[PDB]
Design a protein around this ligand. Sequence first.
Ligand SMILES: *P(=O)(=O)O[C]C([C])([C])[C]([O])C(=O)[N][C][C]C(=O)[N][C][C]S[C]([C]S(=O)(=O)[N][C][C]1O[C](N2[C]=NC3=C([N])N=[C]N=C32)[C]([O])[C]1[O])[C]1[C][C][C][N]1
Lengths: 505, 79
Amino acid sequence: MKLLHERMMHSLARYPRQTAVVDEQDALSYEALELRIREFVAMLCALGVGQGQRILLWAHKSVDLVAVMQAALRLGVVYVPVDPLSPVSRLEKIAGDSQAVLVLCTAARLEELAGSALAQVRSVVLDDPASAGYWRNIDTGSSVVPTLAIQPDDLAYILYTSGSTGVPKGVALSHGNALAFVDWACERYCFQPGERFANHAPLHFDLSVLDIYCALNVGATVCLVPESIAFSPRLLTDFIRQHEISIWYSVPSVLMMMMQDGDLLSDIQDTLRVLLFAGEPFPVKHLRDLRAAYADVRLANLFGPTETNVCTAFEVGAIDPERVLPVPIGTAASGNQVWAQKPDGSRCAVGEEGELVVQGPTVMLGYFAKPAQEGPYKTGDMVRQRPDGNYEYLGRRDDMLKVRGNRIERGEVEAALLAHPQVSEAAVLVVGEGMNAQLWGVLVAHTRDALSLIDLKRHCAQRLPRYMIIDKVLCLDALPRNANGKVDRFALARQVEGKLAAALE
Amino acid sequence: MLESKLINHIATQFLDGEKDGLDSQTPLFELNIVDSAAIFDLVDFLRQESKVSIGMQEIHPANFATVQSMVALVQRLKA
Ligand SMILES: *P(=O)(=O)O[C]C([C])([C])[C]([O])C(=O)[N][C][C]C(=O)[N][C][C]S[C]([C]S(=O)(=O)[N][C][C]1O[C](N2[C]=NC3=C([N])N=[C]N=C32)[C]([O])[C]1[O])[C]1[C][C][C][N]1
């Protein structure tokens, strides 16, 4: 029971007729999911995909995708979720980094792959039975399932994050990494058989690890939120009621859209029992309203980078009428130890600002195809400990950005912008907080001043996911730098002066 | 003429008044012209300019992908 795939087998043995996973089309019992998993195991063997090899899941969530994950885990095959809305060029960079031997995708996006740098990688079609590449058309007659020795700290899956160079970085995560978090969550929130989990986050963000693996760990049901329903906040909240959702896990921005336009505070979703949020500062004005409407719900702020999953958690009590600052991120989670570090390396005193440092079982194996992580992980998140021992998040000093929960390296965006023939230099910064945050590009043009914001967005759309494309651009003749090239961050003053000038009229 | 009021509105609200490359068929979400959080700022303009109330079942991404999608919606919601 030290391996992820063993957890759902244990639940299958206890609860075969109970609903395991739900999407728009199908709803699979644990037995039906088992049969589905066995088909994908047979498929992977028939394709000669062996222990240690990587496969890309480049498709929208479905019960089949969940089965693929269990199947790959059973064979020691490392699965790599890729944003289905991500451009081919970024899929290219990920295929190269992981050296995947197989792409699972829709038939629609095969056409784009024919002209790609992964035209030679084998691909199988998940959706369209009319494709020669349809996964079911692969003949499994001579397939034979091997017996493997898989250790709990063997690599299970890779979640790619934004990379400062433009090449995404792959967080390589072991069975032990996932199960430390899964077991911690299950003990802390007492997830029970037959509860219904909502999977809002896409599979390539680690929030789905709780939604899917905690559900399969306790004999509960995971309900996959389709993008068509994720986009009407009124339909998201109706989704909760129709599926009798009891556990919810999302970034605060999702909860705020459901409050603003989904009737979440007036049409009370009374099946909710545990309401977890993570990834970004939940504006305290709005958390106050949410806590008042759901006063008896387990409600919690979860913290950490993908490199550690949740390393710190805080149970939300009341929200003081006078509170202005976000609720604390709390104390150590997932079996880890946590402290704030001075630059000298020593432990901060209470009240001192320091960098969060994490040591324990959810700390990643390391970046894929890069040297292993040794010792405690420095997160880059600045923190301060309160007299009561809880930590408060302060922000970062480096170039990692957040826009509505999405992790964005300044260098990934800058690299796409600088590649434009007319862009000479480029700096990216976020202006505004919360739902008003906007991604700005501060550029230096080679010629004239004629740069179309739309031409810049199409150019970015070929390289970046949509949430990484700049909202607004600011053209000036020089970027301000310190004596050793660091961008002066006084561009924020320049941007604020631009926005204020427009309000004046 | 719905297309004219939306092409115009979108440039000032989301392109800082630059109508250079925008038309009825440009994909608004793929180009991060319209984000997650500005979806209702658009629905609010369609309720005042077109004078028809938008439903929850029709806050589908296909209806708001493009200006040609939003105009078709108002024609659809009118008859
Ligand atoms: P639209 O299409 O613009 O809006 C739609 C929507 C759904 C909002 C869209 O924008 C969206 O899908 N959001 C994506 C956010 C998401 O799904 N989650 C990403 C996982 S977040 C985090 C891992 S991380 O590496 O990506 N971020 C780590 C980084 O984040 C900061 N941080 C984490 N946790 C907090 C908290 N509680 N408070 C403040 N900041 C926080 C830190 O800087 C950290 O270093 C997850 C979260 C749990 C474990 N990893």
